[PDB]
Amino acid sequence: EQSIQLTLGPWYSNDGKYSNPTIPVYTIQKTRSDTENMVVVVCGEGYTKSQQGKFINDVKRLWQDAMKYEPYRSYADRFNVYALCTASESTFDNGGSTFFDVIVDKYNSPVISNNLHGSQWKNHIFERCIGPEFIEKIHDAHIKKKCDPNTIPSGSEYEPYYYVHDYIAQFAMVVNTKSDFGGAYNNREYGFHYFISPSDSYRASKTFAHEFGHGLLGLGDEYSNGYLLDDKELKSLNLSSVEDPEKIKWRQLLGFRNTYTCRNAYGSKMLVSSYECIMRDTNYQFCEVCRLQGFKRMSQLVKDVDLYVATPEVKEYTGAYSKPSDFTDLETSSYYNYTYNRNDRLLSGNSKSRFNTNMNGKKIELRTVIQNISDKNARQLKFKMWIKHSDGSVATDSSGNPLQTVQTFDIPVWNDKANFWPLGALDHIKSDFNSGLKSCSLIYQIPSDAQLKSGDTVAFQVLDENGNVLADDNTETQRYTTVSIQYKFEDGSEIPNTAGGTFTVPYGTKLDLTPAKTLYDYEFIKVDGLNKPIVSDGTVVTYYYKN
Ligand SMILES: [Pr+3]
Numbered sequence: 001e002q003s004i005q006l007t008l009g010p011w012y013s014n015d016g017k018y019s020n021p022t023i024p025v026y027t028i029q030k031t032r033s034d035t036e037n038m039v040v041v042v043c044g045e046g047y048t049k050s051q052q053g054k055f056i057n058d059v060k061r062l063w064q065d066a067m068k069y070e071p072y073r074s075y076a077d078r079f080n081v082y083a084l085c086t087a088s089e090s091t092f093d094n095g096g097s098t099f100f101d102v103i104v105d106k107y108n109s110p111v112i113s114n115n116l117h118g119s120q121w122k123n124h125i126f127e128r129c130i131g132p133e134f135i136e137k138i139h140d141a142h143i144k145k146k147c148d149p150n151t152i153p154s155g156s157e158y159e160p161y162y163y164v165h166d167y168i169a170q171f172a173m174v175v176n177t178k179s180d181f182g183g184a185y186n187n188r189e190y191g192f193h194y195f196i197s198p199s200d201s202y203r204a205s206k207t208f209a210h211e212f213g214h215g216l217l218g219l220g221d222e223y224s225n226g227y228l229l230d231d232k233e234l235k236s237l238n239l240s241s242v243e244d245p246e247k248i249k250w251r252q253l254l255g256f257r258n259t260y261t262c263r264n265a266y267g268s269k270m271l272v273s274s275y276e277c278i279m280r281d282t283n284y285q286f287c288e289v290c291r292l293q294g295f296k297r298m299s300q301l302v303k304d305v306d307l308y309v310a311t312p313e314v315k316e317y318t319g320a321y322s323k324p325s326d327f328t329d330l331e332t333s334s335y336y337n338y339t340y341n342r343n344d345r346l347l348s349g350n351s352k353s354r355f356n357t358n359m360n361g362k363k364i365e366l367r368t369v370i371q372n373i374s375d376k377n378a379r380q381l382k383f384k385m386w387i388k389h390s391d392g393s394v395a396t397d398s399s400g401n402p403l404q405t406v407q408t409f410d411i412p413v414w415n416d417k418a419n420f421w422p423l424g425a426l427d428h429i430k431s432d433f434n435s436g437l438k439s440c441s442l443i444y445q446i447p448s449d450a451q452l453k454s455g456d457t458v459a460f461q462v463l464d465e466n467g468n469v470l471a472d473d474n475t476e477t478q479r480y481t482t483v484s485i486q487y488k489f490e491d492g493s494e495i496p497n498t499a500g501g502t503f504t505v506p507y508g509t510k511l512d513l514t515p516a517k518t519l520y521d522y523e524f525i526k527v528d529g530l531n532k533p534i535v536s537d538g539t540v541v542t543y544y545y546k547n
């Protein structure tokens with residue numbers, strides 16, 4: 001019943017196959033008003049009308065897998081996700097008429113082909129046709145359409161549609177295929193902000209997360225080549241050509257986790273902050289620079305996130321990799337020697353048990369990086385680190401003083417915030433990487449007379465101004481729990497055109513989001529499952545709406 005209808009003239013459907021399509025809308029996730037969340041619109045390519053159930057399930061699978069990656073995972077409940085069941089005449093594999101005219105070119109790139117049927121504006125379909133109709137009818141802002149997409153505007157062909165990518169944070173097109181490909185089309189000045197990825201390739205979920213990293217998070221392809229000119233250096237969130245560690249944009253992250261600048265290939269002038277990143281090789285996670293930049297980017301699209309605390313680590317402090325000149329060699333051999341050295345020193349996460357009674361007289365370092373998201377409030381965070389016996393008690397020296405140290409760190413305001421992909425931006429041009437950013441290092445000299453026992457480990461906390469624990473020595477390896485969303489009428493019926501998905505949260509999380517007052521035209525009644533610790537996989541939060 002819930003749908004949008006398009007009018008596709010010859011510029012969008014020159015063969016008449018999709019002149020007046022009805023597109024069923026499915027809500028996969030709507031946790032808050034569209035005006036407070038990042039709205040993601042996903043359409044299917046090469047799914048026939050009888051395959052739309054497969055399409056919906058494919059979107060849920062790809063989306064749920066994407067939300068397992070940081071930094072998306074920290075925002076998982078602040079996305080609203082809609083699946084638009086665009087029906088193709090042919091399956092993709094059969095090779096006939098499809099909704100989006102996607103072809104795979106000789107570089108293995110999936111491209112919307114305007115020339116396939118001579119639909120001269122086919123690759124403008126998201127921001128000129130689908131987007132405006134969705135934002136008028138489905139999106140809570142209900143912005144009325146401004147221009148007829150089948151006519152030529154007066155003046156700019158593009159400006160009337162710029163608003164679309166402020167109300168829809170990302171368009172994704174899932175192709176019904178096992179073929180391994182992926183493409184991201186980011187050029188907001190000319191209306192383009194979508195990506196294309198396959199439903200069933202061997203790495204479908206990894207590709208989706210990678211292309212989403214290009215599209216939403218603004219991250220550059222870490223496999224690309226060349227020396228970045230000054231303007232492109234300023235423009236790039238996660239690539240550099242600056243060889244001098246004292247000058248490179250992400251200098252504050254050097255030596256934190258696997259952040260060690262290196263060439264992305266032998267002899268390359270293109271540098272990455274970590275050789276192991278999903279933006280270079282889809283088998284990896286997002287590196288710390290990409291997590292920081294992506295977290296900052298998404299914070300611009302919601303209103304209630306004001307701090308980023310990267311997962312802290314503890315390392316034996318030997319002096320290795322502690323000053324800029326330790327980072328001057330940019331070869332992969334240096335990157336891996338660095339990561340090996342880190343593992344030899346690690347005392348946190350799954351290396352907590354490497355602590356031992358030979359640690360007396362050694363130094364240990366608690367390290368993380370903190371980004372203030374506020375442009376108004378400076379922050380003061382207190383770090384505490386101590387030696388903990390296996391029974392939970394605090395270890396002492398031989399005079400009974402606790403083996404504990406504390407240090408407060410000042411995090412300056414993000415004064416440069418308006419230069420970093422704010423709402424309405426067509427591109428990112430220049431930002432000060434260090435604005436609002438503070439690398440925090442707390443070094444503790446374990447006394448020579450420490451009364452260490454077998455099974456001791458390093459404990460720590462990062463505390464806000466009120467003593468709330470923002471991260472601790474359990475954060476990195478804590479258990480995550482799956483939460484399922486369901487949309488129901490007051491009589492218990494499942495609401496049509498919903499397909500509530502799952503995401504994960506840390507065990508014990510209390511969800512505290514204000515439900516959207518409407519779902520389609522249905523009025524919100526009540527929700528069951530918010531504000532209570534999530535302690536079981538398959539926990540269901542049920543949003544009840546009026547029939
Ligand atoms: Pr009614």
Ligand SMILES: [Zn+2]
Nearest residue numbers: 277279287290
């Ligand atoms: Zn990266």
